[PDB]
Design an enzyme around this catalytic site. Structure first.
Site, PDB file in Angstrom:
ATOM      1  N   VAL B  41      37.995  38.957  31.249  1.00 31.96           N
ATOM      2  CA  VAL B  41      38.418  37.953  31.963  1.00 31.96           C
ATOM      3  C   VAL B  41      39.156  37.807  33.465  1.00 31.96           C
ATOM      4  O   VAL B  41      38.933  36.935  34.186  1.00 31.96           O
ATOM      5  CB  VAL B  41      39.632  37.026  31.206  1.00 31.96           C
ATOM      6  CG1 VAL B  41      40.928  37.740  31.108  1.00 31.96           C
ATOM      7  CG2 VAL B  41      39.768  35.416  31.670  1.00 31.96           C
ATOM      8  N   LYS B  42      39.733  39.090  33.623  1.00 27.14           N
ATOM      9  CA  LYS B  42      40.405  39.357  34.923  1.00 27.14           C
ATOM     10  C   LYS B  42      39.508  39.544  36.081  1.00 27.14           C
ATOM     11  O   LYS B  42      39.968  39.345  37.187  1.00 27.14           O
ATOM     12  CB  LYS B  42      40.981  40.717  34.879  1.00 27.14           C
ATOM     13  CG  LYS B  42      42.225  40.648  33.952  1.00 27.14           C
ATOM     14  CD  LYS B  42      43.536  39.407  34.192  1.00 27.14           C
ATOM     15  CE  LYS B  42      44.722  39.599  33.763  1.00 27.14           C
ATOM     16  NZ  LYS B  42      44.800  39.697  32.203  1.00 27.14           N
ATOM     17  N   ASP B  43      38.276  39.425  36.028  1.00 27.35           N
ATOM     18  CA  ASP B  43      37.355  39.517  37.291  1.00 27.35           C
ATOM     19  C   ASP B  43      37.377  38.206  37.951  1.00 27.35           C
ATOM     20  O   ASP B  43      37.270  38.410  39.066  1.00 27.35           O
ATOM     21  CB  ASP B  43      35.830  39.582  36.699  1.00 27.35           C
ATOM     22  CG  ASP B  43      35.580  40.829  36.134  1.00 27.35           C
ATOM     23  OD1 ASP B  43      36.434  41.900  36.077  1.00 27.35           O
ATOM     24  OD2 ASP B  43      34.294  41.351  35.794  1.00 27.35           O
ATOM     25  N   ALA B  46      40.669  38.462  39.972  1.00 23.09           N
ATOM     26  CA  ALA B  46      40.690  39.691  40.944  1.00 23.09           C
ATOM     27  C   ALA B  46      39.907  39.149  41.962  1.00 23.09           C
ATOM     28  O   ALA B  46      40.308  39.347  43.443  1.00 23.09           O
ATOM     29  CB  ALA B  46      40.072  40.784  40.198  1.00 23.09           C
TER      30      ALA B  46
END
Lengths: 339, 331
Positions: B41-43, B46
């Site tokens: 999920v952090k893409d 980011a």
């Protein structure tokens, strides 16, 4: 809205490889097979093999899929199996690392550990897995199949019907060449069938690592597999049933150092951290692009992530032991402002 | 045809969760954020964090992104950084999974492990990473930014603009409820905003692990945390800037055993091997579906893969040591 993880298999994107494209005056694209839910290209064959066995009635709920692999095939098969109500018996050499045994076990594969051996030996894990399947078919009410990735042509069929058609669609009919490495040969042979049906002028190239026989066979008709490679999932010593009738238009033999240079620069420069076969494949794509010349569209396969090879392929100590290059960034600190 | 790996971020599919759906009389879907190129999920955050810094003229090639993170943020940031010509300096608590540390080093992050410490302590990873960004800024001519995920609201914005719009689109406007767990709160607050703009009676739930303060806050008005969780990437003790103005319609506290039971059953029954937060989320989804009643469409997030916590979350010895269930198939 999708009914299971299985509907997320395939339709993977094409990623433009910028350094490879700049270098060649071509658009070189890598198909992101790492974005399959099983995290490799083998999701396609795994789906097709299991669906085929279902269609032919050889598996019922609770049945077993047997395969000799260590082993994206094992991962793909186990994910698909668990999504459809089946089990996997993955035959593995006992001398393979605790790392690869744990990735398969994590997903619910039942490992059958056996002594390591070469293909000429009948107790070689590939060959043994076939006879195990025939045996289990008698004591498993719900069936037991040999996935048989190397010689089961529904492997090739998967790439005819999915991979090739996705590539044709996503290049808007403009693909001029396709390159891939060979394990089973499903990817290369099947994608070649699919593409050449759309446009017979598309050129197909084999990208072969050291230690494989196929380059020698297709170029000179010799039967020789000189050297070796640390690359995994590729490097084939016979004409499998998936390779039958297949002739590449070009063939390249890629040394490990050329593959690793590409692979390591890809991490630092393009944010892609991929397995060894991707290094071989990109090297092949560069060579194909140079042979066709500028202004062409080349597609190859980015088969899986580099995370699975971390302890060898991205391990300085192992790489130096093999006299191969090392990732520049892993050798290389700051004053941390505590309080 | 995608110009770089960055164009594969987002547009993740919804996977129907069959047991959860059957148990509740609802269609329950998990959004497959594990299919992002950074494998989490952090893409999304980011990408938004780095692009925002670029637009403000804070980064040029050769510049450095500094972050204090449980690991995934640093993974996403490092992938995006490397694609665009930046470096990362990642501050991680030494308590986080070995597999995240390994992936960080592998993608080329300069990895700085520090001791676990609560947010009141100025050596807490988040607070410390802010001072490191300040320090590096003085001698980085190409720029040094603090990603600042917890309090940088372009995080939440990513989910308003992508996550939420995808969910609305891919459910053909039928989505009735959304649930997720909170680390920074970008996912839950951002998605809720985007969804509620399109339909204001979509209901939103928080799924909170033991050790977090948020369930207690929303249900009693007081930030109070009790116990601990082995789940990573979630578990928040304050109202972060990404949580400003967020109020859930329902809130559930999910014990680890309930989360792991779901996770382990999911491997064997549905072919999905997911991270700790996904178990917390699916548990929440089941409870939200039950509160909304049968015939509804509930969506949650499948944040990352189980292999990212393999040495703990799917490790019999560690789980037994924590008095937690063990996957049956590991003999």
């Amino acid at each position: 809205m999708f009914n299971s993880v299985l509907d997320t298999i395939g339709n993977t994107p094409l990623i433009r490889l910028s350094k490879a494209s700049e270098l060649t005056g071509c658009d070189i694209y890598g198909k992101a097979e790492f974005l399959n839910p099983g995290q490799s290209v083998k999701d396609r064959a795994a789906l097709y093999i299991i669906r085929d066995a279902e269609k032919r009635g050889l598996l019922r709920p609770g049945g077993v899929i047997v395969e000799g692999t260590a082993g994206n095939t094992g991962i793909g098969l186990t994910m698909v199996a668990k999504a459809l109500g089946y089990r996997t018996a993955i035959v593995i050499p006992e001398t393979q690392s605790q790392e690869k045994k744990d990735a398969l076990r994590l997903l619910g594969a039942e490992l059958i550990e056996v002594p390591a051996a070469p293909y000429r030996n009948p107790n070689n894990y590939v060959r043994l897995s076939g006879r195990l399947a025939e045996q289990l078919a008698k004591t498993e009410p719900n069936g037991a199949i040999w996935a048989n990735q190397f010689d089961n042509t529904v492997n090739r069929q998967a790439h005819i019907e999915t991979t090739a058609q996705e590539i044709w669609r996503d290049t808007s009919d403009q693909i001029d060449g396709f390159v891939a490495a060979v394990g089973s040969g499903g990817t290369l042979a099947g994608t070649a069938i699919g593409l050449k049906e759309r446009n017979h002028n598309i050129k197909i190239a084999l990208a072969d690592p050291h230690g494989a026989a196929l380059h020698a066979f297709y170029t000179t008709g010799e039967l020789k597999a000189e050297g070796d490679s640390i690359t995994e999932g590729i490097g084939q010593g016979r004409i499998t049933a998936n390779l039958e009738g297949f002739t590449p238009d070009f063939s390249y033999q890629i040394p490990d150092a050329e593959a690793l240079d590409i692979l390591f620069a890809l991490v630092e420069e393009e944010g892609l951290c991929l397995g060894g076969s991707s290094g071989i494949n990109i090297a092949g794509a560069i060579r194909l692009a140079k042979d066709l010349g500028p202004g062409h569209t080349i597609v190859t396969v980015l088969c899986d992530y580099g995370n699975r090879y971390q302890s060898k392929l991205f391990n300085p100590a192992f790489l130096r032991g093999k006299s191969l290059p090392v990732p520049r960034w892993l050798e290389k600190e700051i004053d941390i402002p505590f309080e």
